[PDB]
């Protein structure tokens, strides 16, 4: 500290007195993130784990809003054969809130999963399920042989093959009108060049892997300027006390020490402010208790020493800090032999103005030599 005092005054010699060199502060340990129990989960499991599945031509549409897209539990399960995402990474959308989400479920053949693509053209894409060029969602499919098959086969599925014109993107229409070719019109009968739009669709246990039925659920996420209704799973870290650490309480960032408090908040109140409109009390989102927010150390470093003549040792005074927190106030990085002696060890005295290191407390009273504060003075005499 003598060298620091010398070079703060731009002189190799110093006089008797106290000089302020620098300041100290306490680093946050890692971080703090807190959140309540849970927000309401989206009914994605109901669509995925559904006993009955609608046909591809009559795919059911469900509105998903006012919940959380907790798809991370199933993403890592790897229980779905296809999890391809178009226009966005599967994990990137997790940390984002989407205003409108829709769920579409249908059962198609294994080889027909490729037809569910943005802008895809085919007998199924252009007649049963059409996807627009703007497809921000992902296509999810998995095997359904254990549920959509039985002895003797199944014949409860239907699909559309013939229509007057190509289906518009995300357009569904059901009608019993028989498609009639322009060259050979039928005028309302089942004659030549006239086939019913609906045809029998079924599966049997003897079908191959590409012919087995597959349960396909289409989840799409898009953004609106309206307040968001769907978001991603929230993460919550452990809560620590009596330690200076960064905190993030429901988006409120800050640095300080979170300790227990005796003040009681109102049932609806969340934050707390003082006369100087600074946050100093934030409730725990998990459980109902109030934690105060306090600064870690602040303060400054002051060096107390006599003149360079007839004396060489120095004493260091830290302002507005407790003697227990001194070793972690900007340390563990300096040159050890001549800095740990002035930071820890003996000759530790706690004063009103702060913690004093390197000076031995004496019960005797003498005339003031070096001003410190609260009637405490330091002298080089024995």
């Amino acid at each position, epitope marked *: 500290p003598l060298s620091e005092t010398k070079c703060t005054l731009k002189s190799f010699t110093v006089e008797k007195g106290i000089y302020q060199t620098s300041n100290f502060r306490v680093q946050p340990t890692e971080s703090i993130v807190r959140f309540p129990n849970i927000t309401n989960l989206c009914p994605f499991g109901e669509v995925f784990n559904a006993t009955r599945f609608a046909s591809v031509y009559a795919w059911n549409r469900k509105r998903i809003s006012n919940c959380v897209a907790d798809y991370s539990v199933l993403y890592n399960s790897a229980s779905f054969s296809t999890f391809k995402c178009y226009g966005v990474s599967p994990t990137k959308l997790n940390d*984002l809130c989407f205003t409108n989400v829709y769920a579409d479920s249908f059962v198609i053949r294994g080889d027909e999963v490729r037809q569910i693509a943005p802008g895809q053209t085919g007998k199924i894409a252009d007649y049963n399920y059409k996807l627009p060029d703007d497809f*921000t*969602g992902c296509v999810i499919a998995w095997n359904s042989n254990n549920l959509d098959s039985k002895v003797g086969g199944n014949y409860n599925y239907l699909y559309r093959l013939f229509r007057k014109s190509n289906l518009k993107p995300f357009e569904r229409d059901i009608s019993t009108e028989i498609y009639q070719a322009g060259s050979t019109p039928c005028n309302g009968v089942e004659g030549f060049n006239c086939y019913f739009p609906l045809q029998s669709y079924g599966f049997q246990p003897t079908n191959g892997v590409g012919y087995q039925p597959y349960r396909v659920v289409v989840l799409s996420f898009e*953004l609106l*300027h*309206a307040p968001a209704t769907v978001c991603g799973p929230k993460k919550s870290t452990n809560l620590v006390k009596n330690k200076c650490v960064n905190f993030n309480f429901n988006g409120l960032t800050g640095t300080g020490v979170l300790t227990e408090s005796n003040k009681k908040f109102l049932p609806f109140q969340q934050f707390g402010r003082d006369i100087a409109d600074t946050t100093d009390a934030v409730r725990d989102p998990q459980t109902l208790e109030i934690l105060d927010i306090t600064p870690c150390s602040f303060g400054g470093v002051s060096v107390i020493t006599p003149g360079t003549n007839t004396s060489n040792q120095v004493a260091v005074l830290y302002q507005d800090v407790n003697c227990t927190e001194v070793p972690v106030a900007i340390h563990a990085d300096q040159l050890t032999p001549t800095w740990r002696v002035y930071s820890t060890g003996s000759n530790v005295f706690q004063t009103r103005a702060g913690c004093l290191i390197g000076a031995e407390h004496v019960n005797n009273s003498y005339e003031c030599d070096i001003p410190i504060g609260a009637g405490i003075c330091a002298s080089y005499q024995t």
Partner: nanobody
Amino acid sequence: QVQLVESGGGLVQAGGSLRLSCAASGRTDSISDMGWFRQAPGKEREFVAVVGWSGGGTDYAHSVKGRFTISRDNAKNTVYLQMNSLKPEDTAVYYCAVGSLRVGSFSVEYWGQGTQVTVSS
């Protein structure tokens, strides 16, 4: 009423690059996303690209994925759309459209006048 003003465009050859700018004026405080549309002579309009308010979450059409680039300047209320690896099939009149991304169809509350872009072989 939101007003859209377009600028840029022109004639470009195969493998060239082009830039498009669409500006929004009026009650733009409730506007977050703007998209571009194309239609060929005798063909319906189709989605091209879109940029979010924060600059992320952009989605491109399958035929144009990995080739286009879009950027939004909130300070100037103008969105710059960059074209790379252009192909003669990209010859159409480009329309910038202000709307909200909705599942099923990108609804547009107001459509801009637009400008033409020609790509030769």
